[PDB]
């Protein structure tokens, strides 16, 4: 099926999912000089105090940490959003080397990785229904660069050897996502899509200006995961990012400067 190789990678996706060439595809390059400052934009409200993580899964494309989204426990609101979005999962995209890995770029710069905290609009009642709507999702993107460790990521890094191959999962309770956030909530925002198949155009993207730092050892452990299932040939899970897509007729707004 779809994946990230020469033969099933991003350049192939449009054959099974024609929306790949659509008008509001993600990710995009964030041109920080042409982003429009909007003093009308509200601060983001990230309300993660009551987050309930449940499990961590290797789905053959990335690893997801899934949260209980059956009540308003971990929510995103404000910023550019009308109404309230519940956290369902986070995952990352990363590279084979530190010089690449992010999906969004900032003035053409790729970061080592990119975290996506995926949230769905409470008015659609669940994730499966929200993705069918143009305002269905709000995904908070946070760039990772390599430097000092992010202590709040380590619980994640340490479980990865238990989910090495496609389809493995592990219980993953009491993980606090607030420990993945940088200090500033200044953001760019634009309307876009899932960055993987089905590439649905349902996402309000909220990309934080400030990257978090992770250690080289932390990202190296992302790279030891596998795309393949246990007992198929080993393909390291690296370079699971989609390149920047044409902005077409969208403007990126900034909450700052
Ligand atoms: C009800 O379960 C689910 N059902 C179907 N798709 C899901 N997730 C697809 C997805 C793909 C890409 C991105 S991205 N890379 O744009 O952030 C975000 C979510 C989930 N789910 O994981 O919540
Ligand atoms: Zn993603």
mmCIF file of C-alpha atoms and ligand atoms in Angstrom:
data_model
loop_
_atom_site.group_PDB
_atom_site.id
_atom_site.type_symbol
_atom_site.label_atom_id
_atom_site.label_comp_id
_atom_site.label_asym_id
_atom_site.label_seq_id
_atom_site.Cartn_x
_atom_site.Cartn_y
_atom_site.Cartn_z
ATOM 1 C CA UNK A 1 0.000 0.000 0.000
ATOM 2 C CA UNK A 2 1.088 3.653 0.421
ATOM 3 C CA UNK A 3 4.285 4.440 2.191
ATOM 4 C CA UNK A 4 7.477 6.422 1.918
ATOM 5 C CA UNK A 5 9.663 4.500 -0.569
ATOM 6 C CA UNK A 6 10.714 5.057 -4.181
ATOM 7 C CA UNK A 7 7.766 2.965 -5.300
ATOM 8 C CA UNK A 8 4.920 3.902 -2.913
ATOM 9 C CA UNK A 9 6.134 7.296 -1.561
ATOM 10 C CA UNK A 10 4.633 10.745 -1.552
ATOM 11 C CA UNK A 11 5.101 11.254 -5.329
ATOM 12 C CA UNK A 12 2.919 8.130 -5.884
ATOM 13 C CA UNK A 13 0.065 9.004 -3.566
ATOM 14 C CA UNK A 14 -2.066 10.964 -5.982
ATOM 15 C CA UNK A 15 -2.893 7.688 -7.891
ATOM 16 C CA UNK A 16 -4.922 6.278 -4.990
ATOM 17 C CA UNK A 17 -5.819 9.668 -3.451
ATOM 18 C CA UNK A 18 -6.294 12.281 -6.143
ATOM 19 C CA UNK A 19 -6.828 15.002 -3.507
ATOM 20 C CA UNK A 20 -2.968 14.841 -3.280
ATOM 21 C CA UNK A 21 -3.017 17.433 -6.038
ATOM 22 C CA UNK A 22 -5.834 19.440 -4.470
ATOM 23 C CA UNK A 23 -6.114 23.042 -3.558
ATOM 24 C CA UNK A 24 -5.299 22.888 0.235
ATOM 25 C CA UNK A 25 -2.609 20.236 0.635
ATOM 26 C CA UNK A 26 -0.119 20.005 3.486
ATOM 27 C CA UNK A 27 2.624 20.471 4.426
ATOM 28 C CA UNK A 28 3.850 23.752 3.027
ATOM 29 C CA UNK A 29 6.881 25.897 3.200
ATOM 30 C CA UNK A 30 6.327 28.706 5.704
ATOM 31 C CA UNK A 31 7.754 31.815 4.182
ATOM 32 C CA UNK A 32 8.141 33.865 7.399
ATOM 33 C CA UNK A 33 8.468 37.116 5.531
ATOM 34 C CA UNK A 34 5.286 36.750 3.542
ATOM 35 C CA UNK A 35 3.193 35.394 6.479
ATOM 36 C CA UNK A 36 0.638 38.034 7.480
ATOM 37 C CA UNK A 37 0.701 39.239 11.060
ATOM 38 C CA UNK A 38 -2.846 39.176 12.346
ATOM 39 C CA UNK A 39 -3.400 41.160 15.670
ATOM 40 C CA UNK A 40 -6.973 39.763 15.521
ATOM 41 C CA UNK A 41 -5.674 36.204 16.224
ATOM 42 C CA UNK A 42 -6.285 34.938 19.772
ATOM 43 C CA UNK A 43 -3.649 33.268 21.840
ATOM 44 C CA UNK A 44 -3.789 29.526 21.456
ATOM 45 C CA UNK A 45 -5.413 27.843 24.422
ATOM 46 C CA UNK A 46 -3.756 24.444 25.005
ATOM 47 C CA UNK A 47 -5.571 22.704 27.816
ATOM 48 C CA UNK A 48 -3.737 19.463 28.490
ATOM 49 C CA UNK A 49 -3.980 19.193 32.350
ATOM 50 C CA UNK A 50 -6.403 16.301 32.157
ATOM 51 C CA UNK A 51 -4.864 14.373 29.291
ATOM 52 C CA UNK A 52 -5.272 10.599 29.321
ATOM 53 C CA UNK A 53 -2.799 8.709 27.177
ATOM 54 C CA UNK A 54 -3.753 5.089 26.580
ATOM 55 C CA UNK A 55 -1.458 3.337 24.183
ATOM 56 C CA UNK A 56 1.402 3.654 21.734
ATOM 57 C CA UNK A 57 1.250 2.049 18.405
ATOM 58 C CA UNK A 58 3.527 1.429 15.456
ATOM 59 C CA UNK A 59 1.158 1.629 12.513
ATOM 60 C CA UNK A 60 3.789 1.021 9.902
ATOM 61 C CA UNK A 61 4.114 4.711 9.003
ATOM 62 C CA UNK A 62 4.926 6.387 12.346
ATOM 63 C CA UNK A 63 4.219 5.663 15.989
ATOM 64 C CA UNK A 64 1.101 7.162 17.519
ATOM 65 C CA UNK A 65 0.404 7.891 21.093
ATOM 66 C CA UNK A 66 -3.406 7.713 21.508
ATOM 67 C CA UNK A 67 -5.422 9.515 24.191
ATOM 68 C CA UNK A 68 -8.953 8.989 25.547
ATOM 69 C CA UNK A 69 -10.911 11.591 23.609
ATOM 70 C CA UNK A 70 -14.383 10.537 24.993
ATOM 71 C CA UNK A 71 -14.598 13.670 27.204
ATOM 72 C CA UNK A 72 -13.176 17.210 27.028
ATOM 73 C CA UNK A 73 -9.922 16.302 28.771
ATOM 74 C CA UNK A 74 -7.085 17.582 26.551
ATOM 75 C CA UNK A 75 -8.352 20.366 24.368
ATOM 76 C CA UNK A 76 -7.168 22.983 21.927
ATOM 77 C CA UNK A 77 -9.147 26.150 21.431
ATOM 78 C CA UNK A 78 -8.788 29.851 20.739
ATOM 79 C CA UNK A 79 -5.926 30.815 18.426
ATOM 80 C CA UNK A 80 -7.553 30.826 15.015
ATOM 81 C CA UNK A 81 -10.213 28.315 15.998
ATOM 82 C CA UNK A 82 -13.943 28.629 16.512
ATOM 83 C CA UNK A 83 -15.030 26.028 18.989
ATOM 84 C CA UNK A 84 -13.188 23.276 20.691
ATOM 85 C CA UNK A 85 -10.931 20.493 19.535
ATOM 86 C CA UNK A 86 -10.121 17.358 21.503
ATOM 87 C CA UNK A 87 -6.672 15.696 21.424
ATOM 88 C CA UNK A 88 -6.847 12.240 19.990
ATOM 89 C CA UNK A 89 -3.224 11.328 19.248
ATOM 90 C CA UNK A 90 0.244 12.634 18.565
ATOM 91 C CA UNK A 91 2.875 11.263 16.246
ATOM 92 C CA UNK A 92 6.092 12.489 14.611
ATOM 93 C CA UNK A 93 7.758 12.505 11.189
ATOM 94 C CA UNK A 94 11.548 12.315 11.160
ATOM 95 C CA UNK A 95 14.494 11.904 8.882
ATOM 96 C CA UNK A 96 17.330 9.500 8.176
ATOM 97 C CA UNK A 97 19.671 12.308 9.237
ATOM 98 C CA UNK A 98 19.301 15.417 11.411
ATOM 99 C CA UNK A 99 19.286 17.703 8.411
ATOM 100 C CA UNK A 100 15.798 16.578 7.330
ATOM 101 C CA UNK A 101 12.661 15.072 8.739
ATOM 102 C CA UNK A 102 10.147 17.849 9.181
ATOM 103 C CA UNK A 103 7.120 18.187 6.931
ATOM 104 C CA UNK A 104 6.633 21.940 7.193
ATOM 105 C CA UNK A 105 9.688 23.991 6.423
ATOM 106 C CA UNK A 106 10.413 27.542 7.558
ATOM 107 C CA UNK A 107 12.050 29.641 4.847
ATOM 108 C CA UNK A 108 13.005 26.377 3.243
ATOM 109 C CA UNK A 109 14.738 25.102 6.396
ATOM 110 C CA UNK A 110 13.951 21.436 7.302
ATOM 111 C CA UNK A 111 14.094 20.474 10.964
ATOM 112 C CA UNK A 112 15.160 17.054 12.274
ATOM 113 C CA UNK A 113 11.559 16.104 12.985
ATOM 114 C CA UNK A 114 8.065 17.422 13.422
ATOM 115 C CA UNK A 115 5.521 16.577 16.132
ATOM 116 C CA UNK A 116 1.824 16.608 15.303
ATOM 117 C CA UNK A 117 -0.764 16.862 18.100
ATOM 118 C CA UNK A 118 -3.969 16.005 16.294
ATOM 119 C CA UNK A 119 -7.268 17.313 17.618
ATOM 120 C CA UNK A 120 -10.859 17.004 16.274
ATOM 121 C CA UNK A 121 -13.715 19.475 16.309
ATOM 122 C CA UNK A 122 -16.096 18.583 19.173
ATOM 123 C CA UNK A 123 -19.115 19.575 17.111
ATOM 124 C CA UNK A 124 -18.677 16.526 14.827
ATOM 125 C CA UNK A 125 -18.727 14.154 17.702
ATOM 126 C CA UNK A 126 -15.845 11.991 16.719
ATOM 127 C CA UNK A 127 -12.628 11.804 14.759
ATOM 128 C CA UNK A 128 -14.017 9.654 11.968
ATOM 129 C CA UNK A 129 -16.753 12.192 11.267
ATOM 130 C CA UNK A 130 -14.574 15.294 11.800
ATOM 131 C CA UNK A 131 -12.093 14.238 9.002
ATOM 132 C CA UNK A 132 -14.879 14.421 6.499
ATOM 133 C CA UNK A 133 -15.330 18.118 7.278
ATOM 134 C CA UNK A 134 -13.375 21.184 6.131
ATOM 135 C CA UNK A 135 -13.017 22.372 9.716
ATOM 136 C CA UNK A 136 -12.788 18.894 11.193
ATOM 137 C CA UNK A 137 -9.251 18.927 12.634
ATOM 138 C CA UNK A 138 -6.736 21.194 14.254
ATOM 139 C CA UNK A 139 -3.207 19.846 14.155
ATOM 140 C CA UNK A 140 -0.571 21.574 16.304
ATOM 141 C CA UNK A 141 2.866 21.157 14.635
ATOM 142 C CA UNK A 142 6.035 21.604 16.624
ATOM 143 C CA UNK A 143 9.459 21.398 14.986
ATOM 144 C CA UNK A 144 12.243 19.377 16.586
ATOM 145 C CA UNK A 145 15.902 20.345 16.315
ATOM 146 C CA UNK A 146 18.843 18.399 17.593
ATOM 147 C CA UNK A 147 20.570 19.795 20.667
ATOM 148 C CA UNK A 148 19.842 19.383 24.348
ATOM 149 C CA UNK A 149 17.490 16.527 25.292
ATOM 150 C CA UNK A 150 13.771 17.077 25.833
ATOM 151 C CA UNK A 151 13.266 15.308 29.171
ATOM 152 C CA UNK A 152 9.473 15.195 28.534
ATOM 153 C CA UNK A 153 10.058 13.087 25.425
ATOM 154 C CA UNK A 154 12.078 10.454 27.119
ATOM 155 C CA UNK A 155 9.180 8.322 28.323
ATOM 156 C CA UNK A 156 8.261 8.037 24.682
ATOM 157 C CA UNK A 157 11.795 7.229 23.502
ATOM 158 C CA UNK A 158 12.148 4.463 26.088
ATOM 159 C CA UNK A 159 9.049 2.438 25.005
ATOM 160 C CA UNK A 160 9.929 2.378 21.284
ATOM 161 C CA UNK A 161 11.914 -0.898 21.494
ATOM 162 C CA UNK A 162 8.581 -2.552 22.653
ATOM 163 C CA UNK A 163 6.874 -1.319 19.412
ATOM 164 C CA UNK A 164 9.652 -1.932 16.892
ATOM 165 C CA UNK A 165 7.639 -3.294 13.996
ATOM 166 C CA UNK A 166 4.315 -2.563 12.174
ATOM 167 C CA UNK A 167 1.277 -3.326 14.243
ATOM 168 C CA UNK A 168 2.921 -3.651 17.615
ATOM 169 C CA UNK A 169 1.360 -1.652 20.421
ATOM 170 C CA UNK A 170 1.945 -1.083 24.084
ATOM 171 C CA UNK A 171 -0.014 0.317 26.966
ATOM 172 C CA UNK A 172 1.196 3.931 27.437
ATOM 173 C CA UNK A 173 -0.537 5.618 30.350
ATOM 174 C CA UNK A 174 0.044 8.886 32.224
ATOM 175 C CA UNK A 175 2.129 10.549 29.495
ATOM 176 C CA UNK A 176 1.925 14.266 29.810
ATOM 177 C CA UNK A 177 2.020 16.038 26.365
ATOM 178 C CA UNK A 178 2.656 19.369 27.996
ATOM 179 C CA UNK A 179 6.272 18.224 28.310
ATOM 180 C CA UNK A 180 6.601 18.339 24.490
ATOM 181 C CA UNK A 181 5.693 22.019 24.150
ATOM 182 C CA UNK A 182 8.236 24.813 23.685
ATOM 183 C CA UNK A 183 8.006 27.923 25.844
ATOM 184 C CA UNK A 184 6.356 30.171 23.310
ATOM 185 C CA UNK A 185 2.858 29.564 21.779
ATOM 186 C CA UNK A 186 3.474 32.082 18.927
ATOM 187 C CA UNK A 187 2.240 30.314 15.768
ATOM 188 C CA UNK A 188 1.587 30.401 12.077
ATOM 189 C CA UNK A 189 -1.720 29.053 10.844
ATOM 190 C CA UNK A 190 -3.176 28.143 7.447
ATOM 191 C CA UNK A 191 -5.895 25.799 6.120
ATOM 192 C CA UNK A 192 -4.539 22.443 4.833
ATOM 193 C CA UNK A 193 -4.837 18.685 4.889
ATOM 194 C CA UNK A 194 -3.722 15.409 6.457
ATOM 195 C CA UNK A 195 -0.117 14.934 5.367
ATOM 196 C CA UNK A 196 -0.646 11.250 4.828
ATOM 197 C CA UNK A 197 -3.250 9.326 2.857
ATOM 198 C CA UNK A 198 -6.218 9.917 2.762
ATOM 199 C CA UNK A 199 -4.853 13.458 2.525
ATOM 200 C CA UNK A 200 -8.269 14.890 3.449
ATOM 201 C CA UNK A 201 -8.583 18.647 3.410
ATOM 202 C CA UNK A 202 -9.980 18.959 6.944
ATOM 203 C CA UNK A 203 -7.091 20.492 8.898
ATOM 204 C CA UNK A 204 -6.529 23.892 10.423
ATOM 205 C CA UNK A 205 -2.775 23.810 10.789
ATOM 206 C CA UNK A 206 -1.270 25.599 13.762
ATOM 207 C CA UNK A 207 2.600 25.515 13.530
ATOM 208 C CA UNK A 208 4.571 26.827 16.516
ATOM 209 C CA UNK A 209 7.289 29.336 15.728
ATOM 210 C CA UNK A 210 9.678 27.933 18.397
ATOM 211 C CA UNK A 211 11.168 24.427 17.934
ATOM 212 C CA UNK A 212 11.809 22.162 20.803
ATOM 213 C CA UNK A 213 15.318 20.633 21.240
ATOM 214 C CA UNK A 214 15.788 16.969 21.386
ATOM 215 C CA UNK A 215 19.054 15.092 21.760
ATOM 216 C CA UNK A 216 20.751 13.246 18.999
ATOM 217 C CA UNK A 217 20.251 10.068 21.048
ATOM 218 C CA UNK A 218 16.484 10.749 21.367
ATOM 219 C CA UNK A 219 15.994 11.034 17.522
ATOM 220 C CA UNK A 220 18.394 8.153 16.864
ATOM 221 C CA UNK A 221 15.924 5.971 18.756
ATOM 222 C CA UNK A 222 13.082 7.058 16.342
ATOM 223 C CA UNK A 223 15.324 5.778 13.547
ATOM 224 C CA UNK A 224 15.563 2.261 15.010
ATOM 225 C CA UNK A 225 11.858 1.641 14.439
ATOM 226 C CA UNK A 226 10.707 -0.392 11.469
ATOM 227 C CA UNK A 227 8.151 0.254 8.620
ATOM 228 C CA UNK A 228 7.864 -3.596 8.145
ATOM 229 C CA UNK A 229 6.028 -6.053 10.310
ATOM 230 C CA UNK A 230 7.900 -8.604 12.555
ATOM 231 C CA UNK A 231 9.171 -11.365 10.152
ATOM 232 C CA UNK A 232 9.210 -9.285 6.949
ATOM 233 C CA UNK A 233 12.606 -7.796 5.760
ATOM 234 C CA UNK A 234 13.818 -4.891 7.911
ATOM 235 C CA UNK A 235 13.245 -1.352 6.568
ATOM 236 C CA UNK A 236 14.141 1.332 9.123
ATOM 237 C CA UNK A 237 11.357 3.853 9.746
ATOM 238 C CA UNK A 238 13.089 7.009 8.585
ATOM 239 C CA UNK A 239 12.137 9.766 6.180
ATOM 240 C CA UNK A 240 8.389 9.324 6.848
ATOM 241 C CA UNK A 241 7.720 12.909 5.790
ATOM 242 C CA UNK A 242 5.848 14.456 2.936
ATOM 243 C CA UNK A 243 7.549 17.281 1.175
ATOM 244 C CA UNK A 244 6.181 20.787 0.944
ATOM 245 C CA UNK A 245 3.252 21.234 -1.326
ATOM 246 C CA UNK A 246 2.198 24.212 -3.388
ATOM 247 C CA UNK A 247 0.584 26.975 -1.352
ATOM 248 C CA UNK A 248 -1.803 27.762 -4.273
ATOM 249 C CA UNK A 249 -4.222 30.428 -3.140
ATOM 250 C CA UNK A 250 -3.726 30.353 0.688
ATOM 251 C CA UNK A 251 -2.114 32.870 3.027
ATOM 252 C CA UNK A 252 -0.240 31.903 6.143
ATOM 253 C CA UNK A 253 -1.158 34.080 9.093
ATOM 254 C CA UNK A 254 1.088 34.723 12.034
ATOM 255 C CA UNK A 255 0.034 35.334 15.613
ATOM 256 C CA UNK A 256 3.226 37.333 16.137
ATOM 257 C CA UNK A 257 5.636 40.101 15.125
HETATM 258 C C1 LIG B 1 -10.222 7.228 14.929
HETATM 259 O O1 LIG B 1 -8.896 6.917 14.489
HETATM 260 C C2 LIG B 1 -8.213 7.485 13.263
HETATM 261 N N1 LIG B 1 -8.826 7.139 12.107
HETATM 262 C C3 LIG B 1 -8.381 7.500 10.883
HETATM 263 N N2 LIG B 1 -7.294 8.281 10.727
HETATM 264 C C4 LIG B 1 -6.605 8.709 11.821
HETATM 265 N N3 LIG B 1 -5.463 9.533 11.626
HETATM 266 C C5 LIG B 1 -5.036 9.935 10.346
HETATM 267 C C6 LIG B 1 -4.127 11.151 10.390
HETATM 268 C C7 LIG B 1 -3.223 11.201 9.306
HETATM 269 C C8 LIG B 1 -2.310 12.256 9.158
HETATM 270 C C9 LIG B 1 -2.260 13.218 10.159
HETATM 271 S S1 LIG B 1 -1.190 14.567 10.037
HETATM 272 N N4 LIG B 1 0.218 13.843 9.489
HETATM 273 O O2 LIG B 1 -1.590 15.451 9.006
HETATM 274 O O3 LIG B 1 -1.039 15.097 11.398
HETATM 275 C C10 LIG B 1 -3.174 13.219 11.249
HETATM 276 C C11 LIG B 1 -4.105 12.130 11.412
HETATM 277 C C12 LIG B 1 -7.033 8.317 13.139
HETATM 278 N N5 LIG B 1 -6.177 8.840 14.274
HETATM 279 O O4 LIG B 1 -5.067 8.494 14.424
HETATM 280 O O5 LIG B 1 -6.646 9.690 15.176
HETATM 281 ZN ZN1 LIG B 2 1.681 14.047 10.968
#
